[PDB]
């Protein structure tokens, strides 16, 4: 608009500016973080919820292989997790809830819900009802 489109020595100036102003996110991402990350955790705790209403979800803190410790939410009803184990984390965004930057999605040692149907691959079990959980527990022990 200023110039719009001319010649004699002049396009370049507001090419520079646009990059510089840039909102979104530069240089892909990692100041924590992304990608499938398997943090082995030993903190089971409970944390509060966002300004709108209350609850008390049960959470488990996990320390990541890529060196970070944060609180992650667990989805599905019920759960157990043991010696360590390795529970794999999606790192999805709420757009926010306090200190809860990620959640650990179902993955290996991260179990799924009390023998059901309803459904079974959100909130999740085993063959027909259960069958998977029985086997799952065995793995870490031996």
């Amino acid at each position: 608009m200023g110039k719009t489109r001319g010649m004699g020595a002049g396009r370049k100036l507001k090419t520079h500016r646009r990059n510089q102003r840039w909102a979104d996110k530069a240089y892909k991402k990692s100041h924590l973080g992304n990608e499938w990350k398997k943090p082995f955790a030993g903190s089971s705790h409970a944390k509060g919820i966002v300004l709108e209403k209350i609850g008390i979800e049960a959470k488990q803190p996990n320390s990541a292989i890529r060196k970070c410790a944060r609180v992650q939410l667990v989805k599905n009803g019920k759960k157990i997790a043991a010696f360590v184990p390795n529970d794999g984390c999606l790192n999805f965004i709420e757009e926010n809830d306090e200190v809860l930057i990620a959640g650990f999605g179902r993955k290996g040692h991260a179990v799924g819900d009390i023998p059901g149907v309803r459904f079974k691959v959100v909130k999740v079990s085993g063959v027909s009802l259960l069958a998977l959980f029985k086997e799952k527990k065995e793995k870490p022990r031996s």
Binding site: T4, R5, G8, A9, G10
Partner: protein, 85 residues
């Protein structure tokens, strides 16, 4: 033998008192930029050789590509300009 030409103007040549046979030629070019369609100009200056002598600054000349007598002096002052009589 040469060599294609670029037009340019004599930026300097006198640093200082005497300089050895050669001049600096600023050349200007532009291209129409895809997208905004405003042309961008981008200079370049090249060190032209002056065995002929008589080449003063603010002088439009023609550069032709030539054998390098050093390195980054690639070009030669193929011709100059002026008028009558």
């Amino acid at each position: 033998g040469l060599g294609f030409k670029t037009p340019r103007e004599a930026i300097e040549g006198t640093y200082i008192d005497k300089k050895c046979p050669f001049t600096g030629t600023v050349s200007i070019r532009g291209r129409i930029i895809a997208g905004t369609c405003h042309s961008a100009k981008m200079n370049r200056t090249i060190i032209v050789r002056r065995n002929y002598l008589h080449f003063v600054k603010k002088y439009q000349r023609y550069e032709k590509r030539h054998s390098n007598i050093p390195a980054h002096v690639s070009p030669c002052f193929r011709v100059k300009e002026g008028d009558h009589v």
